[PDB]
Amino acid sequence: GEELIKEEMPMKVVLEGTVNGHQFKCTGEGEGRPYEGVQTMRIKVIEGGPLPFAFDILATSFSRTFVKHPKGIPDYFKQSFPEGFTWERVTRYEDGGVVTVTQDTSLQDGVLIYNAKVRGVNFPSNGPVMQKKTKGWEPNTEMIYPADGGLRGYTDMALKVDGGGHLHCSFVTEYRSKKTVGNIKMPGVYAIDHRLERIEESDNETYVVQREVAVAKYS
């Protein structure tokens, strides 16, 4: 399982969706160090750009294989290969926005392949998201709970608002292996510290490069 995940792995992503009825399509390519928990992705908006909403609400939909796990915490994600895993997420913003995402992760000729679909509704026209007035995500901790042969993650996350302040959002993720869980050693409860940073931007966020560092730990 893990032996297919090398110290360096490339990844490719296609993401499609609608937010408040606006349709768009993105592609991404990048690479990271799965055991060190660091990854970078270069993302192009290919259809529907420039987006009429903050790219930040898509940022967390573009990579669970690249989490540093200490010796004592089994890695559900890396053990899933070669078949990979799916994740499904619901995010709720404090000002009314709701996002649903479904994601497929597979491994094809040693490349991690991501396919994502995003549906966003009820973002307020005067809020920082539809006004494109956001400045990225604050570092956060996700709580991971084993649940029916898979994992459930919970995060309270804060989106920085340009001019100051935070927009608070919660979400719940269900991570499920495509490999039988009979051949997977399961962790108990644990936490992941995430830092998601935008390192390059161009042409009203039609080109975005973002770096994530994610480290699993005991709670």
Q: Is the Cβ–Cβ distance between 67 and 37 less than 8 Å?
A: yes
Q: Which helix (H) or strand (E) holds 59?
A: helix 56-59
Q: What is the rounded distance in angstroms from the CA atom of residue 62 to the CA atom of residue 118?
A: 11
Task: Map out the domains of the chain as residue ranges.
Answer: 1-219
Task: Choose among 169, 156, 89, 90: nearest CA to 127.
Answer: 169
Contacts (Cβ under 8 Å, ≥6 apart) of 148: none
Q: What is the CA radius of gyration of the chain?
A: 17
Judged by phi (left if over 0) then psi (alpha if -120 to 50, else beta), residue 15 lies in beta
Is the preceding peptide bond at 128 cis, omega within 30 degrees of 0?
Answer: no
Contacts (Cβ under 8 Å, ≥6 apart) of 101: 17, 61, 87, 88, 89, 91, 116, 117, 118, 119
Experimental method: X-ray
CA atoms within 13 A on the CB side of 207: 4
Q: Apex CA 130: angle with CA 125 and CA 134, to 5°?
A: 135
Q: Which helix (H) or strand (E) holds 147?
A: strand 140-147
Task: Choose among 35, 5, 2: nearest CA to 184.
Answer: 2
Please provide residue 163's backbone torsions phi and psi, each rounded to the nearest 5 degrees. 95, -10
Calculate the dihedral angle through the C-alpha atoms of 219, 34, 104, 134, rounding to the nearest 10 degrees: 70
Tokens of 94: 């404090």
